[PDB]
Amino acid sequence: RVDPLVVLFLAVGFIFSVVALHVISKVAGKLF
């Protein structure tokens, strides 16, 4: 049902989304 490459993909996507949220919040607070 679930493939390991799909697991890696969703995990790295989640980590990337989290760090992206962090950095965009940081730059928004810095500029505004």
Binding site: L5, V12, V19, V23
Partner: protein
């Protein structure tokens, strides 16, 4: 909150320590840092230059670490230097300088692009390959060819060449050629013909055909077909020797012979022992080379390829003395590696000590430990094969009730060719003076190699005689192979 290195006074020591912990062990390990092969020299003396040039075509970290350590030590020595105050050794500009977004962007790039792409590439590369060592497309092609294989069509060398011409791994080498081009190239290679321009492709595909032929043999044994396996072994021989399959081929695999003279003059010599039956100068006169310095090379190379001969062969069961129903025995072979120039030695002269099996728990627990201690085989004599190969023996067993392969063929490589050295040269067939009663003949000097084959299938539940057939063929020469029958007397 931490306090980064503001005056560059702590990170130099950290980097120096980190580099020391890597350079030390490497420098330490760098400072710290059975079978006679008579063909290693005779091969490069007969190989053509086009093959040599092709084969030729296809620590500083210690020093840089040491100089970096010296530079860091100099930089440290050039420096000037109640609650606690924690601090981090990393510099301040690395987090507070203008390269602050640089670190985060290179990190997120390495995390989001380099890792997933590389791991997916590695996975797709390791999935498309077969555990045997071939591509999946080639395996599927071979399986489909064996499936819709008419049992009426006889197996030949041309058919297996045509099958190999569909190797998918050849298309990756040259996406511009066609399978017919591959077939023509392999034909020119076997018949010792020049391609003119695609010689680099011909050598490449011939060197790659090894794993392809082994995979085809494995698939044939999986489908339990004996004719295809025998054809595959013969075609491997023909490829490695660069000679078409002929009745008198053991004499054509020799380096310096002319067919137009040998075939037309003589038509009775078909093996090597029959050739050695002739005199010394008679052999050269028959082969039509008339060159003493060149006749010595061919005589030496023809008197140094291994011919097999069994001494004792039977089914053995570990820890017992007889075969019982539904038991798991294995095959034990006592072969005698000989050359066609040596006469035959009777079985009675064997001292019976090399044939008896040791009776100890450590010895009957793993019967292959003593086999895995034999020296490897020397490099093969294939001046037309692109790369360098060692000898190899593919042993396969089938049944005698129908004639079907019943297990995968075991590829044995550890074997002693001591009986082939030039030390025991008095044992010549042309002397016919009963060399058994010789002052130099010591029956304890002749080593008898051993071959043990796991059966992979238990004994039948019935009681009686069940005949088998084990075949031990060569892979590099056209020597006298083994084809014997043996029956397990199930007696309980």
């Amino acid at each position: 909150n931490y306090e980064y290195d503001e005056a560059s006074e702590t990170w130099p020591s950290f980097i120096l320590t980190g580099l020391l912990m890597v350079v030390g062990p490497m420098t330490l390990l760098q400072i710290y840092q059975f079978n006679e092969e008579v063909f290693k020299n005779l091969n490069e003396e007969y190989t053509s230059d086009e093959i040599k040039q092709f084969r030729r075509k296809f620590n500083i970290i210690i020093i840089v670490g040491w100089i970096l350590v010296a530079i860091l030590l100099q930089r440290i020595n050039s420096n000037d230097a109640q609650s606690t105050s924690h601090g981090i050794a990393l510099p301040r500009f690395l987090v507070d300088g203008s390269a602050s977004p640089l670190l985060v962007v290179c990190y997120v790039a390495l995390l989001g692009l380099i890792l997933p792409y590389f791991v997916s590439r590695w996975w797709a590369r390791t999935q498309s390959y077969t555990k045997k060592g071939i591509h999946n497309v080639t395996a599927s092609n071979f399986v489909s060819n064996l499936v819709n294989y008419k049992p009426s069509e006889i197996v030949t060398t041309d058919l297996i060449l045509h099958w190999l011409s569909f190797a998918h791994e050849f298309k990756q080498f040259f996406p511009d050629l066609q399978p017919t081009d591959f077939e023509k190239l392999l034909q020119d290679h076997i018949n010792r013909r020049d391609s003119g321009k695609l010689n680099n492709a011909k050598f490449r595909i011939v060197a790659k055909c090894h794993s392809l032929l082994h995979g085809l043999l494995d698939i044939a044994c999986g489908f339990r077909n004996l004719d295809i396996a025998l054809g595959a072994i013969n075609t491997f021989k023909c490829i490695v020797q660069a000679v078409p399959l002929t009745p008198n081929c053991q004499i054509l695999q020799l380096p310096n012979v002319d067919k137009e003279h040998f075939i037309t003059k003589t038509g009775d010599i078909h093996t090597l022992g029959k050739l050695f039956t002739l005199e010394d100068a008679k052999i050269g006169e028959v082969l039509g080379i008339k060159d003493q310095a060149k006749l010595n090379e061919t005589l030496r190379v023809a008197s140094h390829i291994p011919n097999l001969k069994i001494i004792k062969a039977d089914f053995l069961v570990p820890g017992e003395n007889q075969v019982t129903p539904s038991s798991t025995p294995y095959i034990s072979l006592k072969v005698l590696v000989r050359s066609a120039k040596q006469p035959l030695i009777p079985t009675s002269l064997i001292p019976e000590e090399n044939l008896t099996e040791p009776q100890d728990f450590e010895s009957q627990r793993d019967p292959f430990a003593m086999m895995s201690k034999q020296p490897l085989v020397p490099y093969s004599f294939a001046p037309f094969f692109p790369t360098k190969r060692r000898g190899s023996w593919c042993c396969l067993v089938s049944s005698q009730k129908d004639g079907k392969i019943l297990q995968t063929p075991i590829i044995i490589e550890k074997l002693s060719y001591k009986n082939l050295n030039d030390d025991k040269d008095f044992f010549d067939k042309r002397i016919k003076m009963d060399l058994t009663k010789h002052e130099k003949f010591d029956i304890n000097d002749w080593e008898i190699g051993t071959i043990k084959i796991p059966l992979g299938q238990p004994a039948p539940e019935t009681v009686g005689d069940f005949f088998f057939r084990v075949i031990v063929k060569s892979t590099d020469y056209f020597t006298t192979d083994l084809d014997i029958t043996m029956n397990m007397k199930v007696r309980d």
